[PDB]
Symmetry: C2
Subunit: 257 residues, 2 copies
């Protein structure tokens, strides 16, 4: 469709790398929808140009910052996601974290209604805000900005405010619970390997959730091996990390260096 | 119903029995009107059964079912809970659970109601579930187990395979997480616990370290802490476990 889009967010050049791989993976798997990246003034002029070659729209927006929460102190800036409700040139969109990677076609997500999301691991009565189907609207956008300013986020980021706003999600319509194939984190592979061993081959989206991102690794292509002098508690599944670095190396890196 | 609905647990040895005793005491503390039943296997000592009989309304001796954490092969023994057709509806609770408020309203639920598992929320966690004893379901589950086995070697995989519709059908079969709150979930997303946690109704000490594995100091009300420990970020539940044990269960062990 023409009025539908995949939307991601980059507030700097490091996450722009994630968004570029994400956009490239949506192309690899033949999305029929438009690709949109929301970018802030900290993204370099040259990176915005690169983004415009993968994404149909690059929308400049201002940073929204929860601030210096006690609740990863970098993640105050995630409140910048709420701008996704301002994109009213589209009837329906799928927001995807710039740290996600598409493994198969997921256009069937546009069958779903707002707010459709997958349960968060760790607290599964909240949804994970890395992949969600939503409906652009000026009223919702404004309602969300109001909640963010007046009450804030219980986790200091977008996921708190979004769960607080869409707080019937856990107990209403199971059709808004995305199956886990649409937002699979490495934390869940680690938590319950037997599940991954038996269903994992069905995964359509990988979410590289947690402090250490695929672009914070060193990757040797000659060995197809990855390392980093910063431990990851979520045992980032290497098959997936290697997949990310392949798409990056072949489709994205030549754009940058 | 007072005679016709029950909370059911399982103990295949005297260590997990202490867990069952704490569970049972906790359900009485919070004045359940339902029966309290524990399934026990022969590794449970004769004198421990006699103790379990002081708290539970009935101890019921079952055969160990092993699939063949390797100590969780015996968790297929849980399947025996569907044999309890003296009850029309039961709540099964692991012996590693602990009740913090009255949970009788779980009997409003229909088979199979369970909470999302915190690792892999598309599967339900098999530590707290509402079910209906049935000779038919029981036998179908035995057959599935012998035939296919379990994808995790334990009860949770087989149960999820059997009740496969749980994730995608009827949100009423998803219990709220406060009916099976795992301490690893306090720790992994602490922000959520600080705002939602005060209404926890059941805590499940899931994972390899169980409360009775701790060294507890009864004078100071402290436990010797492990070298990394999610229990010690919100230790109130673990000291509650040991309070109930030291206060209510220990004098029954003499
Ligand atoms: O410095 C940042 C951090 C956040 N993000 C955006 O906000 C999303 C959510 O942050 P992140 O994925 O790192 O949090 P997590 O998934 O690990 O909880 C990212 O994927 C980006 O799209 C960003 O643009 N710049
Ligand atoms: O050696 C054992 C192991 C398991 N269990 C029973 O099976 C349940 C499931 O095991 P556990 O709670 O250890 O698994 P987890 O919830 O940690 O995955 C226990 O709570 C007990 O009711 C038991 O009686 N003896
Ligand atoms: Mn993310
Ligand atoms: Mn347990």
């Amino acid at each position: 469709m023409t009025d539908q889009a995949f939307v991601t967010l980059t507030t700097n050049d490091a996450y722009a790398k994630g968004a570029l791989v994400l956009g490239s993976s949506l192309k690899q798997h033949r999305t029929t929808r438009r690709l949109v990246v929301l970018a802030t003034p900290q993204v370099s002029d040259s990176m915005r140009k690169v983004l415009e070659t993968v994404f149909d729209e690059v929308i400049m927006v201002d940073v929204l910052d929860s601030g210096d929460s006690a609740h990863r102190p970098e993640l105050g800036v995630t409140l910048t996601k709420l701008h996704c409700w301002s994109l009213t040139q589209y009837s329906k969109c799928v927001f995807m974290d710039a740290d996600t990677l598409v493994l198969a076609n997921i256009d069937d997500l546009f069958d779903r209604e707002e707010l459709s999301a997958a349960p968060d691991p760790g607290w599964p009565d909240c949804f994970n805000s890395g992949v969600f189907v939503y409906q652009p609207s000026v009223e919702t956008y404004n309602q969300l900005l109001h909640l963010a300013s007046e009450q804030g986020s219980f986790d200091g980021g977008d996921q708190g405010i979004l769960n607080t706003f869409f707080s019937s999600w856990a107990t209403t319509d199971i059709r808004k619970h995305l199956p886990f194939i649409y937002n699979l984190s490495s934390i869940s592979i680690y938590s319950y390997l037997p599940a991954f061993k038996v269903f994992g081959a069905s995964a359509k989206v990988v979410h590289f959730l947690g402090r250490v991102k695929p672009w914070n690794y060193t990757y040797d292509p000659k060995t197809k091996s990855v390392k980093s002098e910063a431990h990851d508690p979520n045992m980032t599944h290497p098959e997936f990390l290697i997949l990310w670095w392949n798409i990056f190396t072949t489709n994205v890196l030549p754009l940058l260096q």
